[PDB]
Amino acid sequence: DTVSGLSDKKFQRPQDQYPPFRFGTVPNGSTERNIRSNYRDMHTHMVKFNQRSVEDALTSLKMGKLDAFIYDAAVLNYMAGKDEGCKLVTIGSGKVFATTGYGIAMQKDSHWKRAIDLALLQLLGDGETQKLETVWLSGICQN
Amino acid sequence: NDPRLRNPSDKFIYATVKQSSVDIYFRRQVELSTMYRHMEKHNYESAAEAIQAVRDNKLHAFIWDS
Amino acid sequence: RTMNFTYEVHLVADGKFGTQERVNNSNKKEWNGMMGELLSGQADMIVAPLTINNERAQYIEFSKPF
Ligand SMILES: *[C@@H]1O[C@H](CO)[C@@H](O[C@@H]2O[C@H](CO)[C@@H](O)[C@H](O)[C@H]2NC(C)=O)[C@H](O)[C@H]1NC(C)=O
Ligand SMILES: *[C@@H]1O[C@H](CO)[C@@H](O)[C@H](O)[C@H]1NC(C)=O
Numbered sequence: 001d002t003v004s005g006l007s008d009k010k011f012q013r014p015q016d017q018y019p020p021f022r023f024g025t026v027p028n029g030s031t032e033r034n035i036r037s038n039y040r041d042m043h044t045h046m047v048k049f050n051q052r053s054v055e056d057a058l059t060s061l062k063m064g065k066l067d068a069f070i071y072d073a074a075v076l077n078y079m080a081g082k083d084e085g086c087k088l089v090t091i092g093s094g095k096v097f098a099t100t101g102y103g104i105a106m107q108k109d110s111h112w113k114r115a116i117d118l119a120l121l122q123l124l125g126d127g128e129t130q131k132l133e134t135v136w137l138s139g140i141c142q143n
Numbered sequence: 144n145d146p147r148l149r150n151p152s153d154k155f156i157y158a159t160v161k162q163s164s165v166d167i168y169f170r171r172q173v174e175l176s177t178m179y180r181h182m183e184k185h186n187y188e189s190a191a192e193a194i195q196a197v198r199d200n201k202l203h204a205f206i207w208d209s
Numbered sequence: 210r211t212m213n214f215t216y217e218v219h220l221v222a223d224g225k226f227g228t229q230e231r232v233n234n235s236n237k238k239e240w241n242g243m244m245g246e247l248l249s250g251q252a253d254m255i256v257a258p259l260t261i262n263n264e265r266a267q268y269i270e271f272s273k274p275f
């Protein structure tokens with residue numbers, strides 16, 4: 001917990017102290033656009049560490065070429081769970097920033113939207129989604 | 144999933160707020176019919192009064208939004 | 210401010226969020242609480258911690274969760 005916050009001065013000010021913080025993210029995604037539209041300095045620094053192949057970013061973090069990785073919370077929790085060194089998210093619950101969800105994309109003004117929305121809500125209501133979470137996104141040292 | 148909450152009795156009393164999402168959730172569950180059956184005897188008018196009752200040791204467990 | 214509309218805020222009549230229930234001296238189920246007031250027409254929008262669930266989504270339109 002060296003950072004303790006996405007809006008920390010270490011990230012908002014890359015040149016505040018110590019040699020430049022080596023943090024980056026996978027480009028062409030929602031995270032990159034969010035960072036570009038919100039924190040210009042963050043995005044301009046992140047261009048240097050244009051990571052790829054999130055597994056490769058993870059192994060670069062393990063070796064020591066990187067000290068912070070900005071990415072999706074749902075996949076970062078899973079990657080922390082099945083970790084031999086048990087890497088940790090910044091805050092205990094990760095302090096998820098810009099909370100959103102995974103959705104099923106559809107064509108604009110389609111017909112299937114209402115039925116699929118109701119079916120997804122039914123699946124969430126009956127606890128099938130919790131069963132899928134237990135059977136697919138469990139972690140070793142997450143508990 | 145605790146056995147006390149799966150085996151209702153006067154020892155452990157639990158309740159929710161009447162006409163809320165938790166009522167619908169327990170009423171729509173076939174597996175938790177006894178849950179709603181025990182709940183129906185002790186529901187509360189509002190969340191604040193339920194919290195007050197729980198703190199004053201009048202209700203044991205209160206199920207509500209995180 | 211963002212959508213350029215004016216508003217008048219009022220509180221729910223019976224202090225309940227609302228689940229559809231069988232109306233007295235009849236066999237059909239009718240909504241109550243903020244659900245009933247939104248469906249009937251007394252209220253045009255619910256700005257409150259209303260939990261998204263399948264039962265309400267059949268009659269009410271829910272925005273993206275905030
Ligand atoms: C927000 O809505 C108000 C009222 O609908 C708009 O005010 C009107 O603006 C138009 C021109 O922009 C005028 O011809 C009207 O006389 C105005 N009506 C009133 C009651 O002031 C306002 O422009 C809207 N804001 C926008 C479009 O940004
Ligand atoms: C991201 O987009 C740039 C420009 O389109 C491209 O050069 C780069 O390879 C992309 N990164 C990927 C696909 O991981």
Ligand SMILES: *[C@@H]1O[C@H](CO)[C@@H](O)[C@H](O)[C@H]1NC(C)=O
Binds near residue numbers: 233234
């Ligand atoms: C409500 O229904 C009961 C029957 O269960 C009936 O005796 C009573 O008169 C009804 N009340 C009204 C106001 O219609």
Ligand SMILES: N[C@@H](CCC(=O)O)C(=O)O
Binds near residue numbers: 027029031071
């Ligand atoms: N879920 C993300 C992928 C990961 C990321 O690039 O942040 C997206 O679809 O944009």
